[PDB]
């Protein structure tokens, strides 16, 4: 498929926000398709980069990266101070089927809403 | 939160394959926690390892999903190949609650968008 304006719903702590992000080109050097949110300032906008490579085995990489604006004293242009990252990689092999890959994808997707990862990430209290 | 039997529903293309998994110990050397299902085999079971860190907080989630095969002239089965999955979160010390929750939920929801399911299921670029 080709890039399109992707609108993610059901996002946030309270689960009411939603964000619309649109494509912003593909880097020819390494095929890292990029998506961004229209935040009116290029350096203060959320970013997503997705890229699948070619072989012995395949590799799918997703990098989410978003900053937090901070109003510096004595200046009007805000500067990026805190920077949250997120990395995801999948490493299926050649002879793998497709139902197995879908199983991995859906399992990881549902694991991120389980009452385990909620405490793992929101409060950072380790599983014990 | 102490480890508890995690159950997941509506997994896969059909949205019907349910999966139940329970904790299977905590490694003390590196402070990781493990989860698996009971497949009556030492190896051929899906497993998930989760671990947070203590300082640039780092949260890591790894998934191993192996397959089985009937080896030629072997009583026992053998693992042929396994799908991996790795997830990394790298917040900083002054991170707030809302921002981290935003990152988590965005990564979760984006994983079911048509773009990314098409990227994973058919393995094609954009």
């Amino acid at each position, epitope marked *: 498929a080709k890039l*399109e304006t992707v*609108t993610l719903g059901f996002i946030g702590k309270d689960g009411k926000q939603t964000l*619309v992000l649109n494509p912003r080109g593909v880097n020819p050097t390494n095929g890292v398709a990029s998506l961004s949110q229209a935040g*009116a300032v290029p350096a203060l906008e959320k970013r997503v980069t997705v890229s699948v490579s070619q072989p012995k085995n395949y590799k799918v990489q997703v990098k989410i990266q978003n900053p937090t604006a901070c109003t510096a004293n004595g200046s009007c242009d805000p500067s990026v101070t805190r920077q949250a990252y997120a990395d995801v990689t999948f490493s299926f092999t050649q002879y793998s089927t497709d139902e197995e890959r879908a199983f991995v994808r859906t399992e990881l997707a549902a694991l991120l809403a389980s009452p385990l990862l909620i405490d793992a990430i929101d409060q950072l209290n380790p599983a014990y | 939160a102490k480890l508890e039997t995690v159950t997941l529903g509506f997994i896969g293309k059909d949205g019907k394959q349910t999966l139940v998994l329970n904790p299977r110990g905590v490694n003390p050397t590196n402070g990781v926690a493990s989860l698996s299902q009971a497949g009556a085999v030492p190896a051929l079971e899906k497993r998930v390892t989760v671990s947070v860190s203590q300082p640039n907080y780092k949260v890591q989630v790894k998934i191993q999903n192996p397959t089985a095969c009937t080896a030629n002239g072997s009583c026992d089965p053998s693992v042929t190949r396994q799908a991996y999955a790795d997830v990394t979160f790298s917040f900083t010390q002054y991170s707030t609650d809302e921002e981290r929750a935003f990152v988590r939920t965005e990564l979760a929801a984006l994983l079911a968008s048509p773009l990314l399911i098409d990227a994973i299921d058919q393995l094609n670029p954009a």
Partner: antibody
Framework: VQLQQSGPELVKSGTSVKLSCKAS????????LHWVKQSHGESLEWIGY????????IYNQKFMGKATLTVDRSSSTAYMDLHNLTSADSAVYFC???????????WGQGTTL | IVMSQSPSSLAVSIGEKVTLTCKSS????????????LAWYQQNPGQSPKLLIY???TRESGVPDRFTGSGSGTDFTLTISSVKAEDLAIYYC????????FGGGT
């Protein structure tokens, strides 16, 4: 979060009326402030909203001529004007807040005309 | 986007499985992932309304589990676990993406 709406007025003729919403408990950094009009009975229509990330000057149709929106960030309050009023000023106008594209969660008490 | 609602008022008596039906003029799967964009509001005749159900199937904190909604592409239901002493008054259905719009009554 909590917002407050100030005062009912009963002026006649369609010259100009000032309706002000005293917003509190948040900032206009991300949230959007809507101006749903309840009219009378059923069929309460949406007027407009002020989003710094969406433009803040979006108006529902058949209302552009008789509606203007301005918001000041110093006092963290919003207030709108009605250019002409003959019978569309039937009843209460409501003030509500929410996320960018999210639903309308918390509404202040209304003032009728 | 124009919205249509169930007949004006039901004949709710007591303890029955009354379901309010809202049918849309256009599919509300704007979101890339399969999440609808409807909300349900209750409006007592005296004071300001309140939000009940959003994303057409998810409750919000402060509402009993008695309420439930079932989502589809363009036709939706609000099923209530029977009626109790104070759950009366006008119930509103809203799509709230891009251009919002209300419609209908009880």
């Amino acid at each position: 979060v909590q917002l407050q709406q100030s005062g009912p007025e009963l002026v006649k003729s369609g010259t100009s009326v000032k309706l002000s919403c005293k917003a509190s408990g948040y900032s206009f950094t991300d949230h959007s402030l809507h101006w749903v009009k309840q009219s009378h009975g059923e069929s309460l229509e949406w007027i407009g909203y002020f989003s710094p990330n969406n433009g803040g000057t979006i108006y529902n149709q058949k209302f552009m001529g008789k509606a203007t929106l301005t918001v000041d960030r110093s006092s963290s309050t919003a207030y709108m004007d009605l250019h002409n009023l003959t019978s569309a000023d039937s009843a209460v106008y409501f003030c509500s807040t929410g996320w960018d594209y999210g639903p309308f969660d918390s509404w202040g008490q209304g003032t009728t005309l | 986007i124009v919205m249509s609602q169930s007949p004006s008022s039901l004949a709710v008596s007591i303890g029955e499985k009354v379901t309010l039906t809202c049918k849309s003029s256009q599919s509300l799967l704007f979101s890339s992932n399969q999440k609808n964009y409807l909300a349900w509001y209750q409006q007592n005749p005296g004071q300001s309304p309140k939000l009940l159900i959003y994303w057409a199937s998810t409750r919000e904190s402060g509402v009993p589990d008695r309420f439930t909604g079932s989502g589809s592409g363009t036709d939706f239901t609000l099923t209530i676990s029977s009626v109790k002493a104070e759950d009366l008054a006008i119930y509103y259905c809203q799509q709230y993406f891009r251009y919002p719009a209300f419609g209908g009554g009880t």
